[PDB]
Amino acid sequence: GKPNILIIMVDQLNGKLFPDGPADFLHAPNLKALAKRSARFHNNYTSSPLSAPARASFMAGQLPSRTRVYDNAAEYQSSIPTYAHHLRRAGYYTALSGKMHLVGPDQLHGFEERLTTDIYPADFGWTPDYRKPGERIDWWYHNLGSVTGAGVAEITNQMEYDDEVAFLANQKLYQLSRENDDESRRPWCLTVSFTHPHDPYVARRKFWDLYEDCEHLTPEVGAIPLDEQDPHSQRIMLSCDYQNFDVTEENVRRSRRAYFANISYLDEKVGELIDTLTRTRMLDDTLILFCSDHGDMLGERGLWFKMNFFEGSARVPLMIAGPGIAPGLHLTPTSNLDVTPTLADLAGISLEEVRPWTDGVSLVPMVNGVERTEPVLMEYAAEASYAPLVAIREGKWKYVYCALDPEQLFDLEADPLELTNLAENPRGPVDQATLTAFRDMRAAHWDMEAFDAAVRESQARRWVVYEALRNGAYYPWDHQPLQKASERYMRNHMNLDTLEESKRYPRGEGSHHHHHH
Amino acid sequence: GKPNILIIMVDQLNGKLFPDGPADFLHAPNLKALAKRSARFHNNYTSSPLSAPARASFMAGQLPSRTRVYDNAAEYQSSIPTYAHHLRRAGYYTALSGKMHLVGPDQLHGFEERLTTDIYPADFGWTPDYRKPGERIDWWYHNLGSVTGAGVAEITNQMEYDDEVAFLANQKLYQLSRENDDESRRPWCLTVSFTHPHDPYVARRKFWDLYEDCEHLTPEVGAIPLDEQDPHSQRIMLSCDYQNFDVTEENVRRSRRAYFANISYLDEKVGELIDTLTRTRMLDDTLILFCSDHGDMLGERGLWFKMNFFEGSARVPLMIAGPGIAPGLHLTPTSNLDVTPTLADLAGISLEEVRPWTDGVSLVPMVNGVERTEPVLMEYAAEASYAPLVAIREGKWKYVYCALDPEQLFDLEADPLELTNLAENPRGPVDQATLTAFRDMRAAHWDMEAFDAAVRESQARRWVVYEALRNGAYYPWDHQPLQKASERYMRNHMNLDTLEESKRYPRGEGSH
Amino acid sequence: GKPNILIIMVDQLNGKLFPDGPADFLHAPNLKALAKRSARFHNNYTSSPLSAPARASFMAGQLPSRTRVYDNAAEYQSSIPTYAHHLRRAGYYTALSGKMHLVGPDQLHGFEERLTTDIYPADFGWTPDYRKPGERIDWWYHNLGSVTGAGVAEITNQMEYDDEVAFLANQKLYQLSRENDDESRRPWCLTVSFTHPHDPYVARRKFWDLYEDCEHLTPEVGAIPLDEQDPHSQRIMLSCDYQNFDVTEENVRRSRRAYFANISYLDEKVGELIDTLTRTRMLDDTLILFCSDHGDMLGERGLWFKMNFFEGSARVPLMIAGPGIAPGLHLTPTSNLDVTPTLADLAGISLEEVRPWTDGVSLVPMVNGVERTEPVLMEYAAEASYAPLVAIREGKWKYVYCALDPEQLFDLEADPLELTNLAENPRGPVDQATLTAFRDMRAAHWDMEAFDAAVRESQARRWVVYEALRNGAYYPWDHQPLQKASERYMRNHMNLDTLEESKRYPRGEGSHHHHHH
Ligand SMILES: C[N+](C)(C)CCO
Ligand SMILES: C[N+](C)(C)CCO
Ligand SMILES: C[N+](C)(C)CCO
Ligand SMILES: [Ca+2]
Ligand SMILES: [Ca+2]
Ligand SMILES: [Ca+2]
């Protein structure tokens, strides 16, 4: 009765590239086939445009202000329930292959098994410090060297990572298929979390070649000069060391080309996973979700990467396909915060069991024609912020607030590229009432003073602790997968014939000319 | 310049047994000689009368309301600085041998090396539930079978543990001595944390025999009937399943006898540590601390173990000896909360570096004759509480508050056994104004409604997660001491003569 | 400098299926391409028709009587030099992905790194016992259930293993390519050792479908009844529990069809390795060997699997390709015993440094047109033998001796299918004199009484020890691969940009130190 759940997650995928499933110009036949049978959430947003905050929030269905994972080095408490816990409590086998950027000594956070280590660190090294506004840390900050460095390679740090993530996810699916004839097996939930299309913007030749004739290599909004940028965008450019890189038109085109090429790299791995589900005969009983942690400005407005609430950074794709999911396109804004309650709903878990632990809403009713009215909230409190920023997405509007900056208000229906800041330049009385309305809702959801103080305390505490932990012998927190070789394959407490039968799936099949095995 | 630091910690040691170092009737020659040499804090209290809360608070110098380690299964966040971090940041090698009842995947919390696993669990299993007031969990709650089951054995779970804690601590001291002649060495801080004299009250014959003629086998206050007990004591007796145990006078004597015997068992281990320091020539450069996480009523008032603020449960000894420490007896109340700022002060760390992270005060000024006026605060929010309790200890007074119970106010100078509740029976207008003053102080320090809400959220959260974590394959968080065999002793990337010389200490010695 | 060496090994591959590279009827485009550019040894033999003895002898270039690895449970001493030692001593990084059926607590035998555990046991469980002739051990002996159970499945024990073997082999090549521009790098030798096409004869549907119209699904020589079999064949059929299986023609076809399908399964993995070598720019400096431990009778004569000296069981392919290797087909008999001295010769190691440690001869002279006259020797002393057997292969002749059985003498020129035993039915005085000459050679090479005594002592010794080791807590010897997660990918003792550059290969436009092609 309970469906299997395959979560396919990718990193830094601009949601505007999924207008209705993948954009037509992308070479993504597998993701395009998946989308045609999916509920597709067009205006879907991350909870925070940064990896560890987005992913802790994604796992728990809680905003960063609640998980306390403010930045890429903030400890994620083991006691915070995640969709892994909820599903595991409900009888699921739960596994992760790939990245989740969990910081702290808990590298599972409810997952029963984790098949790879993380690509990124698990310690407090990347802790920002609001006491030194304007500083940058060159050994890990984003810099525009990813833009000037884009190109072609046959292996990279990330391609090693994702190649392994995919192999072990498919291996696990093959292993799980051996139970497929047991009606009393546990349903499974496998999260497969790739690091592409995150930079470096570097792609295998095969996929780079797919985009030789690409007509989407120019961003839709050109570079805004530093002196004309809004303050947060200015902070982002300084954090990227913009003044020490000469980003040419060609650099922009090459970066976008490798990025699209790495989507096609991912599409092939999506196809592998679907193929494994199909041939092992678990496709029809498996829900498939496609999601990402945050987007990438990809040169739009002159900006790259994330760390802001503009569409290209804050929007991320979201699709759900499988049993009991009617395909279609949904335009109401939604959030990564809705994924954990949606997963619980699809798993048969009652609303009361998840209500105290989740800040979002289930999307299943929406899949079934029921309007969703809840606004979308977002937060940011890491590098290139000197104080926290919050945003609200509701109806056609986006509102952004930072105690240090002028407000931003965008009418995304009329101004999808967010070129006109209606808080600075209100069109009339309705714009003014709308700003008051969003100010009141902002004040209702966030105490920005308490938010700042909480972030400063978290940073300061971690810097004392991390300074200590980097003296003397280092104790690493990186997850080490363990697959006991002494229990695998054939060992001499076993019966070879029984082993071979148990590891074969499907079983008892095979006919040359006499079609009964 | 920076001294070495040896912290010796024991578990469940009633502080009333250290009036001026160990009480006369205890066979504790090694701890008595240490005490003559130490600043001794007579009226020292734990921050919380329970293992994990007291220990998380002890390491951080923060109360449970700040660490959020409310009970024996509450997660201790890795990001909370401890004295291990403070000393490590300042250039110390830091190590732990033995118990600290850290809950969560971090089993070091700043310690650079940990030589043993913990005796107790590292996961959320022992999480209380304020939604079910009155329940008890038989498979891990205290029960008076410790009292009826006291006796003599040559090995126990705890004796295996402590024998190993002791061996590895002395081994580590020996290993450290090999750097003692190196001017570029780091100073070291070794915490040696024993589980005795925590129950089961079971002792080796050798130490049991020391107390054949002991005159302290009867508690000073007898069993108070359930009807006549204060509400919290009633909760504790119910949690101990008291209705199903017939505790006789013999049981009480046998339990106390084994407890004293296990203090003597520890005293021999204290002697071993000091002997190693002496023969390795590290004694004179080493501060030595003696401390405990909480006490044990030991049958006084009819109660056993801890979980309350009465003297026998809330008082724990505290002594400090070594370079720059004037010996003496101090009567002003102190707290385990003061240990971390004291350690930092002794180690040369500035007050500013530790002020944002510690709720207590350094005891070094007191050691040097400066009056200390800060009150001592305590908290409890675990088994046998249905709502959090707080306590204030200041001057001659102890005040205890729980939203569910009548207040308690004791004048410990006039009523050292806390037999007269002056909140209930004021002696006069000074007692009345004193109660009002402590009420005002409590309200200024604690939002008790927020406290209860925070504890309930922590409990609920953990029960969701722990139920999940006990489905399928279990991933344990217990500490596994580091594996290092390929780098130990003689291996063929090394020169044998160089090895022998480096591992020999003292060096160049001998006299025929 | 010295060349890289990729050793592609497969298990239980009947050498008659590679008459000149792969037979025409096989779907094996990658191995046929490889064969076209290789020196191909048509009449190449295993040293012992069984996995562990063949593989210990292969690694050492020593016969079983010298390695003392007589059977699948015999300890292989760590002190015995292997091609891994020889190459590693000469400056090579050496690695193994996959199977080598090493028995004993040493699971590396000179390999610097092993990327997978073994599919098979590493302890003394499978020790035969000459004190009980006629017994069989049902929980691990071969049985004709492989033939009756042949068919189609998408995962098996062996495809899980070989999928993993392949993935990690290709990953290791990618990792090694990152050193390819460093002139201080070590040359590398990677052995990729697959368990297919060993039974179970079970194949993925994709590859099974390739052999729908196959014309080779029935053996040329059909089943010989027990009462007309030679004694050793009779012992093999009894060991296979042949009396309890009804092997139909359809069963024979299904088994051969799956077997061929698994050759095609392996051919796709060969193409994968070649593709990785090509795109990493490592192909042109890489010697590629293709080899197998023993063959598979595949129903010929009514026999299945190995354990004998007939062509289908004793012949295994051998090809060598790469720098300095002239392609060609060689008909002089060779042996797996020659691989280790050939590898050393090709790696630039002098003959004097390997001569005291190998029984075989380098094939490099033969590749360069020098005649080879050394005979090919083989030994067997495991299951289905009640006493050791030896064989001599020289010129057109094969001679087989066992103290318990009539001699066999075959003229492979006139009788390629070994249907006429010329020791029993000589054609004339030349056949008679040839038998005497092989008798004298046999007596000069082997003391068969001593051989039997040595195998009996080895068996008895292991059974005493194994009986003890299976009491109480078991201590496994299985190899546990370890890739330390605390040193992989991004960790906060590193600079992220330095990391990315080091892990990117090839290093072209956009990389730190590429200024031109
Ligand atoms: C991804 N970086 C590590 C480059 C910066 C944090 O987003
Ligand atoms: C586990 N016990 C409850 C028995 C002791 C800790 O309080
Ligand atoms: C391969 N078996 C394990 C089936 C028997 C030994 O060759
Ligand atoms: Ca990310
Ligand atoms: Ca305790
Ligand atoms: Ca084999």
Residue numbers in the entry:
A (entry chain C), C (entry chain A): 4 to 520
B (entry chain B): 4 to 515
What text does the study give?
Choline-O-sulfatase (COSe; EC 3.1.6.6) is a member of the alkaline phosphatase (AP) superfamily, and its natural function is to hydrolyze choline-O-sulfate into choline and sulfate. Choline-O-sulfatase (COSe; EC 3.1.6.6) is responsible for the first step of this pathway, consisting of the breakdown of COS into choline. This enzyme belongs to the S1 family of sulfatases (subfamily 12) according to the SulfAtlas database. Like other arylsulfatases and phosphonate monoester hydrolases, SmeCOse is a mononuclear metalloenzyme.
No detectable activity was observed for the C54A mutant, whereas the C54S mutant maintained a residual activity below 1%. The extra densities are not present in the C54S mutant structure, further supporting this PTM. Choline is placed at the bottom of the ‘aromatic tunnel’ both in the WT and the C54S mutant structures. In all cases, the quaternary ammonium (quat) moiety of choline appears to be sandwiched at approximately 3.5 Å from the aromatic rings of Trp129 and His145. Asp386 further occupied different positions in the C54S mutant structure. FGly needs then to be hydrated to a geminal diol, it being accepted that a water molecule reconstitutes the FGly diol after substrate hydrolysis. Our choline-bound C54S SmeCOSe structure shows a water molecule at a binding distance from the cation and Ser54, in approximately the same position at which the germinal diol of FGly appears in the WT structure; this water molecule is also at a binding distance from His201 and Lys309.
